[PDB]
Write a protein that binds this ligand. Structure first.
Ligand SMILES: *C(=C)C1=C(C)[C@@H](Cc2[nH]c(/C=C3N=C(/C=C4\NC(=O)[C@H](C)[C@H]4[C@@H](*)C)C(C)=C\3CCC(=O)O)c(CCC(=O)O)c2C)NC1=O
Ligand SMILES: *C(=C)C1=C(C)[C@@H](Cc2[nH]c(/C=C3N=C(/C=C4\NC(=O)[C@H](C)[C@H]4[C@@H](*)C)C(C)=C\3CCC(=O)O)c(CCC(=O)O)c2C)NC1=O
Ligand SMILES: *C(=C)C1=C(C)[C@@H](Cc2[nH]c(/C=C3N=C(/C=C4\NC(=O)[C@H](C)[C@H]4[C@@H](*)C)C(C)=C\3CCC(=O)O)c(CCC(=O)O)c2C)NC1=O
Ligand SMILES: *C(=C)C1=C(C)[C@@H](Cc2[nH]c(/C=C3N=C(/C=C4\NC(=O)[C@H](C)[C@H]4[C@@H](*)C)C(C)=C\3CCC(=O)O)c(CCC(=O)O)c2C)NC1=O
Ligand SMILES: *[C@@H](C)[C@H]1/C(=C/C2=NC(=C\c3[nH]c(C[C@H]4NC(=O)C(C=C)=C4C)c(C)c3CCC(=O)O)/C(CCC(=O)O)=C2C)NC(=O)[C@@H]1C
Ligand SMILES: *[C@@H](C)[C@H]1/C(=C/C2=NC(=C\c3[nH]c(C[C@H]4NC(=O)C(C=C)=C4C)c(C)c3CCC(=O)O)/C(CCC(=O)O)=C2C)NC(=O)[C@@H]1C
Ligand SMILES: *[C@@H](C)[C@H]1/C(=C/C2=NC(=C\c3[nH]c(C[C@H]4NC(=O)C(C=C)=C4C)c(C)c3CCC(=O)O)/C(CCC(=O)O)=C2C)NC(=O)[C@@H]1C
Ligand SMILES: *[C@@H](C)[C@H]1/C(=C/C2=NC(=C\c3[nH]c(C[C@H]4NC(=O)C(C=C)=C4C)c(C)c3CCC(=O)O)/C(CCC(=O)O)=C2C)NC(=O)[C@@H]1C
Ligand SMILES: *[C@H](C)[C@H]1/C(=C/C2=NC(=C\c3[nH]c(C[C@H]4NC(=O)C(C=C)=C4C)c(C)c3CCC(=O)O)/C(CCC(=O)O)=C2C)NC(=O)[C@@H]1C
Ligand SMILES: *[C@H](C)[C@H]1/C(=C/C2=NC(=C\c3[nH]c(C[C@H]4NC(=O)C(C=C)=C4C)c(C)c3CCC(=O)O)/C(CCC(=O)O)=C2C)NC(=O)[C@@H]1C
Ligand SMILES: *[C@H](C)[C@H]1/C(=C/C2=NC(=C\c3[nH]c(C[C@H]4NC(=O)C(C=C)=C4C)c(C)c3CCC(=O)O)/C(CCC(=O)O)=C2C)NC(=O)[C@@H]1C
Ligand SMILES: *[C@H](C)[C@H]1/C(=C/C2=NC(=C\c3[nH]c(C[C@H]4NC(=O)C(C=C)=C4C)c(C)c3CCC(=O)O)/C(CCC(=O)O)=C2C)NC(=O)[C@@H]1C
Ligand SMILES: *[C@H](C)[C@H]1/C(=C/C2=NC(=C\c3[nH]c(C[C@H]4NC(=O)C(C=C)=C4C)c(C)c3CCC(=O)O)/C(CCC(=O)O)=C2C)NC(=O)[C@@H]1C
Ligand SMILES: O=P([O-])([O-])O
Ligand SMILES: O=P([O-])([O-])O
Ligand SMILES: O=P([O-])([O-])O
Ligand SMILES: O=P([O-])([O-])O
Ligand SMILES: O=P([O-])([O-])O
Ligand SMILES: O=P([O-])([O-])O
Ligand SMILES: O=P([O-])([O-])O
Ligand SMILES: O=P([O-])([O-])O
Ligand code: NA
Ligand code: NA
Ligand code: NA
Ligand code: NA
Ligand code: NA
Lengths: 184, 164, 164, 184, 184, 164, 164, 184
């Protein structure tokens, strides 16, 4: 896998040149504590996120929990929960590294084909991933709502800035979009 | 590519874990140490040619037999390639300072080096002397801060070890 | 036992490597973060009985059916053991703050917990509520600094995740 | 494996007690930078150390490089160079961790018995480890001599204190003594 | 794998017939010593052949050692040297056996596809092989030139005949040509 | 296909080796022994029908019960196949004389033979007797040289051992 | 130890086979080629010191820098070791001529050589030059027969290839 | 493994000396064709030898084929036949090589302990090996008797000499004696 810094070195290596422009890299360092908080926000809430996302996918499509549905019977529901957690885990690794390679290499490569062979429905998987994207945005911003928290709300207590880490929210969101695009 | 963060992610993944306390703490180390290593990287980026030239010149001074007919510094092409090679190692050092792990030097410099130099009958001692010169040359605060110089020296010694 | 340093040693050993730049940099992260986590460790060491007591009281407040005949908080021996269990988790959290990785919680708390509670018919929700109360209770700077509290809360959430 | 902090936790758990003495542990932290220097001092000089130590063991015992000697023929010399490097590697791990467990568990357990079955001679193994001990002490203190450096002298340039990291030298030396005691 | 004699057997077995033609077999035997000299001439010079061929491929195509070149960085140079040796090794087996099957089965089958997946350039592979073919011919005939020997000239000292083993030179060349055909 | 040269090539390939001194020396053995084995191969190429016919006749002479209703030489098809099978073994011995190893016999005769003959209820003793007759039949120099006959007899014994 | 016979035995054993035709044939090759290689072995046994001495001399003549202060031939002990090393290679060549395969050189010379020389900072070019001088030196019929010299030269080239 | 020639080399290497006595080695070469005949005589008669030796062991000890006996039931008989063949195979390798090391290393080392753990009886093992020793001597001399051949007599047709290869008979017999030695 690569990280944000090794990605920059691969770029420089393509022209056999030194890494000269360090502005973007120095910004990664200046935002490093906020990146760690973003990772902590997702990891610390991961069980709640996964359960709530799969439950949301289901409440919006009862076919999944009826005869012939892909979260029926118990073994299928369990496999779905496990997959949502795997996906979220690899997205968090991408966010920690600042680079999608770990996610692409170790999670997404071959996933579409795997799901096709099993009959796992794309529409429903995408919706689960979309719910997790929204959850992760709110936890990174430290603005989850009581309305969506089901009596399990958590506040992170990181130092507040006006933008609430918009850059990191966009980057996290982009990794979820990459998951969805791999099924397209 | 080996860095602080790819090492901890690989270990977490092998155990099926989310990032946890010790992973975040490791990356805090990169936040702290980056100043020293990036200082060294910027110095090296801005002066690589002169730094490699003096290292190359030192290795030829130690081994004048390289200038003799049939030896590895004896033609214009060979002289250019040898300087080039010293500059490659310094560039890979620069990349390693950027990444904060030895990944770029391991993958792009060290892997295969012994087999290449064996096949071409290139002696390794001149590579070692160039890097050795570079390792003993810097001083702080003249060239960079004392912790920057520690970072630069450690990567030169890592390269020397790989050839020794 | 998983910590910053044992994770990087294990990764170095698997590759036959001496400690290198990224290993040292990781450990500088422990030098930096240790202040926060050892502050939380100190406060928890000094006040563990009170912290555990109120977390235990909260879980029984949420689940008064546990006091009913035949349920898990209904006798003096059961009451004692439930509070003891809350305190065990808090002590393992204290150890985890000392080490800077989750090792002590992983090995001595989490491993086996689901099998034990299943065998004894003990519900997990009260355990989760005790830890949840503890997680939502602290505030900074009253109890400790904001970063100490972040360390404390992260280990509580790690324990909650393991039971959820 | 354990480190200095998890060792303290194991000791506390033997009486199911919190870790209350923060002082010896806060001393570990205060000396952390010097510990990283001490590890860098050994790792950075490891090839020179190993080769000089094994060469020293040989120059003091020429029987090793004659017919029937355990550094004869080339294969055996190579195996010996490999072992001195393995041993030094594990000692350096123990110094980074501040605990001997990795060294005892992954290197020393069963080693004496292994060497006995192969006929690897004890006195000579101990001698090589003695020379590496002595080298390590000099590099940690940053006082190697030109007399012993064979034109390969290195200076670390770490900030000098009057004690020249006496506690870390004692610690490193104790790990080498563990190796020697296990093989004696 | 087959050899020249088992080739004749497989051809006969296709018609469940005895091998009737002893003359062709006896000719293999009659040139057996010259065949062993041909193999000795390649094997004895293999390191020099491989290094010279790869170096020649590079001096004719400097792109290989410039940015994005397939002999850059060290790891790729080393893989290329290894491959040229492997190919020469299987060609020399084919010459010892008097049959291409070991070369087809154990080296060439699948190799063009392996190289396409890696992006190893066909024109450069072919050139390295062409150089090795020309080297082999000269060493079999025991007429290498000083001009191509780089101060590393070797003389085999085999007993000279007027045709300088023309048939074996043609056969060896045919094996290199098989490589070239398979890889282009 | 097992021969002198394929055996040494396979051993060299397993170790990543070019042909070396013992490989060449082995093949010199083929140069030396070839005259004897190709002499036998030529005899057999010219006279395989008569050789096989008499060996077949001998095995039926030994075991006349094979002519009884229900037995393996009892019908015209069976008689033809049994003679054909003796000729197949002889042909595979001819091939093995050509190759100078047992490969042809191993791969095209021996492999599977026991399973085939068990399935079809074919007794092995008549096969052994045909080959045994052929093994005791030759004499030198009447039929071929003493070393040609050594080669021929060794392959017959190899076949006999495989069926014993 | 690799020879004609141990190679065939090892191949037989891997397949659970008795010695068979191609094994005996291979060993006949040893009978045949032995005269040439044993002639070379006898010549080398009777004159090893002079052969090694001149090859050593030639490598120092090529690389007089080795005598300069600090280098690998510059002291009396180093000088003696280097000559000794050249003689070790020639003794292992003598052994390989006796065996008829490369086993003695492989096991007692080649294995580990690169790691030893690397660790000790010993350049490989002078070893190559000593062996190269020895490879180009012989002529037939002065020194031995043409085929004895072929055997001798092939083992020298084997050793050279191992170091190149 | 070693052969007779590498055995001489190991002995020379004990004093880092050249192999100087070409005499005994030139004797191995002079008797090489006889040695090939001796190997052929055993390998060619191996099935008959094994079956007869195991049958002989049993006719002299009927306890082996009664309840409780080590050649009862069919599985055990089969395993015994297999072992006798294995032993004869490794003896034949030793005779081809002119050295016992492959026999010692690959067959005999651990055999005593293996048989003791299984309850394979030593006394009977010895008898089977003794019978094979006697058979081998007769086949090497090409003097098997009709009396012992059970309708399966084979003659080898090698060139007869007055001593009937006495030195090779003695050598072969020494290898069978090593098998027996290894059981105690
Ligand atoms: C079925 C009836 C059904 C659901 C189940 C539910 C699914 C759903 N959830 C969200 C949004 C969020 N869920 C969040 C989760 C949590 N918040 C916490 O504080 C805890 C730790 C954790 C677990 C409960 C969060 C953070 C969000 C983000 C929004 C917010 O906080 O306000 C959605 C919205 C998804 C979208 O925007 O596309 C859905 C659909 N909804 C159901 O209908
Ligand atoms: C053979 C005749 C023979 C030897 C070979 C040699 C072995 C030996 N070496 C030492 C002590 C050290 N060697 C050191 C190594 C190095 N210093 C450097 O600067 C580089 C990087 C590196 C490789 C050359 C070091 C640091 C020492 C420590 C002492 C010092 O610096 O003065 C000893 C002494 C061991 C002891 O003190 O017990 C020996 C025996 N000596 C030989 O006789
Ligand atoms: C780059 C500037 C460049 C080269 C490098 C070189 C490559 C090259 N080499 C040949 C031909 C041969 N090389 C030979 C090698 C050797 N001869 C020896 O005696 C030693 C043991 C060995 C290694 C040096 C040999 C034998 C030949 C055959 C020709 C001859 O001997 O005269 C070629 C020509 C290939 C062809 O004909 O297609 C090339 C291009 N040339 C460079 O320009
Ligand atoms: C049980 C009643 C019993 C036996 C079974 C038999 C066992 C036995 N066999 C021998 C000696 C030999 N057997 C030989 C075997 C063969 N000769 C052949 O020609 C074919 C190919 C092959 C298989 C039948 C041979 C060669 C001998 C050697 C002696 C000779 O040929 O005359 C012995 C004697 C062993 C000894 O001397 O210690 C025994 C005991 N005998 C039984 O009583
Ligand atoms: C979006 C992600 C958040 C947010 C985050 C911010 N965090 C800032 C500072 C900060 N965070 C930490 C904790 C972090 N560092 C570590 O070493 C570890 C674990 C090992 C973690 C979890 C630290 C130490 C700091 C620095 C100290 C301090 O500032 O108090 C922070 C301020 C700096 C910056 O602007 O980048 C921000 C903004 N802020 C938001 O508004 C959302 C909710
Ligand atoms: C004995 C080991 C030495 C010695 C060492 C000292 N080092 C001191 C400070 C120091 N060292 C480093 C480098 C270290 N920290 C890292 O993060 C990394 C790599 C990632 C390394 C290699 C740093 C950053 C610092 C702090 C900055 C500074 O002080 O300049 C130090 C002073 C502090 C102390 O007293 O503990 C000492 C004494 N000193 C000696 O005399 C011997 C030679
Ligand atoms: C093209 C390849 C050569 C060439 C070769 C010739 N070699 C001839 C004879 C010969 N070669 C050997 C050595 C060979 N036999 C072995 O057993 C081993 C190793 C185990 C090797 C390397 C021997 C023994 C002999 C026979 C003795 C002799 O003739 O001196 C040879 C002559 C016979 C023939 O015409 O085939 C030739 C032609 N000759 C050339 O002109 C190019 C350079
Ligand atoms: C004791 C073992 C025998 C016996 C054997 C003798 N064999 C003699 C010569 C001989 N044997 C062979 C065949 C052998 N060489 C091979 O290359 C192969 C297979 C690849 C085999 C099986 C040959 C070629 C020769 C040489 C030709 C000949 O002389 O006819 C032999 C005579 C030479 C000598 O004294 O060593 C003997 C004595 N003799 C006996 O009395 C017992 C039965
Ligand atoms: C400390 C005072 C030393 C010492 C240092 C000197 N260095 C001198 C020149 C010099 N050094 C370098 C390498 C340096 N430049 C870099 O960019 C980097 C790393 C990225 C390093 C380590 C260069 C290229 C040069 C030439 C250009 C320049 O002057 O900066 C120097 C001047 C005289 C000379 O060239 O030797 C000194 C005095 N000298 C000492 O004696 C102590 C130990
Ligand atoms: C921030 C001002 C909060 C808030 C906090 C209060 N906590 C109160 C009491 C309390 N808190 C704890 C847990 C705390 N003690 C520890 O040792 C540690 C961790 C090691 C933690 C997290 C305890 C045990 C207690 C009781 C003992 C005490 O008084 O310290 C408290 C007093 C009133 C009360 O009990 O609730 C407050 C005010 N209160 C708020 O309203 C904001 C949101
Ligand atoms: C040596 C004098 C023997 C012996 C030999 C006899 N063989 C006789 C006939 C015979 N043999 C064969 C087999 C032979 N022909 C081949 O082509 C091959 C191998 C490829 C072999 C081994 C055949 C087919 C025949 C019939 C045709 C012919 O006559 O050649 C024979 C004539 C009388 C008879 O048929 O028995 C003799 C005398 N006889 C002996 O008693 C000693 C031991
Ligand atoms: C063929 C006539 C050559 C040639 C040969 C010369 N060699 C001379 C001396 C010489 N050669 C060796 C190596 C040789 N001795 C051995 O024992 C073995 C292998 C076991 C070999 C390959 C030595 C040690 C010596 C010095 C001792 C001696 O004189 O025998 C030589 C004498 C003059 C000189 O030293 O150069 C000649 C003429 N010379 C030629 O011009 C053609 C090409
Ligand atoms: C001569 C061409 C060299 C040269 C050589 C030196 N070799 C040194 C030490 C050394 N050499 C070997 C290999 C040797 N030992 C064996 O057992 C075998 C094969 C059986 C061989 C070929 C070893 C294992 C060693 C290390 C042990 C020892 O000291 O004997 C040596 C001393 C180096 C040192 O102590 O630093 C030298 C000088 N010198 C030259 O100039 C060229 C390059
Ligand atoms: O490490 P990776 O290749 O990304 O999986
Ligand atoms: O990889 P290398 O070639 O071993 O350096
Ligand atoms: O370990 P667990 O039982 O699964 O919790
Ligand atoms: O981890 P460990 O157990 O120490 O090896
Ligand atoms: O043996 P192979 O099948 O040819 O590879
Ligand atoms: O193969 P087999 O069938 O067993 O004979
Ligand atoms: O074995 P080496 O060391 O690679 O030569
Ligand atoms: O090879 P070996 O060891 O004899 O088994
Ligand atoms: Na090294
Ligand atoms: Na969970
Ligand atoms: Na093609
Ligand atoms: Na059999
Ligand atoms: Na090579």
């Amino acid at each position: 896998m690569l990280d944000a810094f090794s990605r920059a070195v691969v770029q420089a290596d393509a022209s056999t040149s030194v890494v000269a422009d360090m502005g973007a890299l120095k910004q990664f360092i200046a935002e490093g504590n906020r990146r760690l908080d973003a990772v902590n926000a997702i990891a610390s809430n991961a069980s709640c996120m996964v359960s709530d996302a799969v439950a949301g996918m289901i409440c919006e499509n009862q076919g999944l929990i009826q005869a012939g549905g892909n979260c029926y019977p118990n073994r299928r529901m369990a496999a779905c929960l496990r997959d949502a957690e795997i996906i979220l885990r690899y997205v968090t690794y991408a966010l920690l590294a600042g680079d999608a390679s770990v996610l692409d290499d170790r999670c997404l490569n071959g996933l579409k084909e795997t799901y096709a062979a099993l009959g796992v429905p794309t529409t429903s998987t995408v919706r689960a991933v979309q719910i997790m994207k929204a959850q992760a945005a709110a936890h990174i911003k430290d603005t989850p709502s009581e309305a969506r928290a089901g009596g399990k709300l958590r506040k992170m207590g990181s130092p507040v800035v006006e933008d609430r880490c918009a850059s990191l929210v966009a980057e996290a969101s982009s990794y979820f979009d990459r998951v969805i695009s791999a099924l397209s | 590519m080996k860095s602080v963060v790819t090492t901890v992610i690989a270990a977490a993944d092998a155990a099926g874990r989310f990032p946890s306390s010790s992973d975040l703490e490791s990356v805090q180390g990169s936040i702290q140490r980056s100043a020293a290593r990036l200082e060294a990287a910027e110095k090296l980026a801005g002066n690589i040619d002169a730094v490699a030239q003096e290292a190359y010149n030192a290795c030829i001074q130690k081994y004048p037999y390289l200038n003799n007919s049939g030896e590895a510094n004896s033609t214009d092409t060979f002289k250019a390639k040898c300087l080039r090679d010293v500059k490659h190692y310094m560039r890979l050092i620069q990349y390693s300072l950027v990444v904060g792990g030895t990944g770029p030097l391991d993958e792009w410099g060290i892997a295969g080096q012994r087999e290449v130099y064996r096949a071409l009958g290139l002696p390794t001692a001149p590579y070692v002397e160039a890097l050795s010169f570079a390792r003993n040359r810097g001083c702080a605060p003249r060239d960079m801060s004392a912790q920057a110089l520690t970072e630069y020296n450690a990567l030169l010694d890592y390269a020397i070890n790989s050839l020794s």
